[PDB]
Structure 1
């Protein structure tokens, strides 16, 4: 039985070597949480992917923690989200939301997103001396963008700005997250009303129209969905941007490939998505098995058991990715699991990609001599929260 969480290595740029040790040895392992209880972790791409794709696993591992709230908004909402549903229930929702959350909407949103970035860089360029990229760019952009998509804007945004950061909270800070949540549930309750009697081209405007029409889609679901989207896409993207730049700056010979060559970027982004993970599980909530399961390597996972898809290392599996533990931004073959797989596959997978693309491009393009205001050594990740995020990222150029 192995101790999980693992040790957190010295560098922010390295991972627990314990991960590769397992993936290339026993591959499947059982683990114990402090807590005491026994779980299981899979490490192979095949296996990880099976866990997410196979329908004998369940994402209902928080179902009592949410009932045990419930009565807070936080808990009402853990019960109401996609990422926590299964079976038919999840299918109905995902289906309903995609009637408006489509690749097309997202594709068409790229131009705005470019401006949203340009603008934040326009403010970045009038701030003084070394400047923290986290506070001033990485944390704000994805909300802006989620706002633009939802139909919040654009007054209302210096308020939202508060509620949103409250949720960036270090996961222990429950009372302060519970507060913002509530402000948001009412805020969106209101926004609906106004969007209904003056729609525009945005996610909510569309959902209402669906909901008002001939469909079971209710205002509450819309609200849940709208927040689900925020929580899910905010911390996430914000962390990655910073991490990515760091990683690039760490590998200057791989970064030089993206200089003066903007068509190289979509590939670069997917390589970092692969190589630079959210967590060990790549932000994926542990699945628990609804029944017993046979794996690639022969091992069998028992029914009623917690399972950790360890995406962080499955995305370096040498069976799949040739030269996997090194960053190749030219990589053409790269079927990474950063956005998961199976029915829970990131709803914002394309959007994320666009944001990240647009962000790098703009930085490279407008601030190409961008160096860390020094140094790799001093960087430090956030104690809590859960996602691998930098506390700050002072940069100069």
Structure 2
């Protein structure tokens, strides 16, 4: 009995850190902007598998971001936790979405990211000093990839870095949770911590975004205390986990393309372009594109009906050969313009330029301070996270010149 299905199981896991899962390359190859998939609980949904339809759909207000909707395309138990938990603005639609997002934008402006560059370099070179002095081998993840953006986002938010063991652990448990209870637990841990910080700030105003939200919006009744907790938690978790994942994966990927990595070292003006290429190619938040239709939507002769789930899969859309010639080839010299690693439209990544600055600084610093960096293990021995979470590795053994 043939087992071929026209709604394959989704998501799928990467077998190579920088290549689409076999299932996804297949989805990519099927003509038409949309394909049926079967989600973990048996329910069916659409995935968007082409670049222009991804942009169009991400821009269509008929696709809601409400993750508490009964028909939201839950991809794992994490989403069961999401569905019964309070929502940050990532799960809101206009006009509510804008009123919350605009409370946070001031920290992420181009001018502000510019003026973070000296601070990001200090943090990066700080953790490099320590790692290089500490041993001849290291886990790049715990010793460098994670602490750097952790310290940077903590200062932006006004979250004390002194508490980093606690909130880094809770962030991991939440984002990488495989069951709903573990996710709810990690969320509750972070929420109680952030609640304490809020009270503290009400007594003694504090620095950072959390400090400003407490002194301004909360005091005016413009945000709920619970919403402020959700907002700070989103930025705190996004701020840690995304750039950390890009760092480890970029290192693995560049070391597998030595000719391009050498070109990069020889001409640092190539770094911003290389960062855009690595973003396109690694697409680490590739299912952070879930939606539910609130009205019927016609998509090139296919119909998304009201109440149906839609996942905009940006890793697949980033490998659209009609936009990126030889899409599965890493090319730090290509134009990776218009890529969807950060989404598109009203929910386009708030932190995108912070992430870009961090990755530029990091790559330049590794090339400068540790040009002999190499993996301490074969790529094959690394353990990749599953396709239900942010892509990456939890451990990355590295070594360098003895």
Matched, 1:130 2:137: yes
Residue matched to 2:41: 35
Residue matched to 1:258: 264
CA displacement at 1:79 relative to structure 2: 3.1
Q: Summarize the Cα distance change of 1:105–1:165 in structure 2 as closer, same or farther, 3 Å threshold.
A: same
Equivalence map 1:176-325=2 (5 Å): 176-195=182-201, 199=205, 201-211=207-217, 216-278=222-284, 282-295=286-299, 297-325=300-328
CA displacement at 1:201 relative to structure 2: 5.0
**SS in structure 2 at match of 1:217:** coil
Structure 1 runs not aligned, ≥5 long: 67-73
Q: For residues 229 and 380 of structure 1, what CA distance do their matches in structure 2 show?
A: 27
For the Cα contact (< 8 Å) 2:14–2:387, is it kept in 1? no
Equivalence map 1:378-397=2 (5 Å): 378-383=381-386, 386-397=389-400
CA displacement at 1:202 relative to structure 2: 2.0
Q: For residues 65 and 301 of structure 1, what CA distance do their matches in structure 2 show?
A: 13
Residue of structure 1 aligned with 2:115, choices 84, 108, 113: 108
1:327-375 deviations in Å (ceiling 9; x for gaps): 1112235210100011111111111111111111111111011111131
**SS in structure 2 at match of 1:167:** helix
Q: Summarize the Cα distance change of 1:293–1:206 in structure 2 as closer, same or farther, 3 Å threshold.
A: same
Q: Summarize the Cα distance change of 1:174–1:107 in structure 2 as closer, same or farther, 3 Å threshold.
A: farther
Matched, 1:2 2:14: no
Q: Summarize the Cα distance change of 1:165–1:126 in structure 2 as closer, same or farther, 3 Å threshold.
A: farther
Q: For residues 11 and 100 of structure 1, what CA distance do their matches in structure 2 show?
A: 35
Deviates more, 1:150-159 or 1:43-52: 150-159
Matched, 1:15 2:24: no
CA displacement at 1:166 relative to structure 2: 3.6
For the Cα contact (< 8 Å) 2:149–2:243, is it kept in 1? yes
For the Cα contact (< 8 Å) 2:287–2:313, is it kept in 1? no
Residue matched to 1:93: 100
Equivalence map 1:146-165=2 (5 Å): 146-165=153-172
RMSD: 2.7
CA displacement at 1:307 relative to structure 2: 1.2
Give the TM-score taking structure 2 as reference length: 0.87
Q: For residues 331 and 93 of structure 1, what CA distance do their matches in structure 2 show?
A: 36
**SS in structure 2 at match of 1:329:** coil
Aligned length: 387
For the Cα contact (< 8 Å) 2:292–2:307, is it kept in 1? yes
For the Cα contact (< 8 Å) 1:101–1:203, is it kept in 2? no
For the Cα contact (< 8 Å) 1:3–1:34, is it kept in 2? no
**SS in structure 2 at match of 1:248:** helix
Q: For residues 393 and 384 of structure 2, what CA distance do their matches in structure 1 show?
A: 4
Matched, 1:117 2:121: no
Residue matched to 1:328: 331
Structure 2 runs not aligned, ≥5 long: 1-5, 73-80
Q: For residues 239 and 378 of structure 1, what CA distance do their matches in structure 2 show?
A: 18
CA displacement at 1:126 relative to structure 2: 2.3
CA displacement at 1:384 relative to structure 2: 7.8
CA displacement at 1:200 relative to structure 2: 5.9
1:148-204 deviations in Å (ceiling 9; x for gaps): 111123433444444344435x31255454344334323323323444565565222
For the Cα contact (< 8 Å) 1:57–1:288, is it kept in 2? yes
Q: For residues 277 and 94 of structure 1, what CA distance do their matches in structure 2 show?
A: 23
Give the TM-score taking structure 1 as reference length: 0.88
CA displacement at 1:135 relative to structure 2: 1.8
Q: Summarize the Cα distance change of 1:327–1:231 in structure 2 as closer, same or farther, 3 Å threshold.
A: same
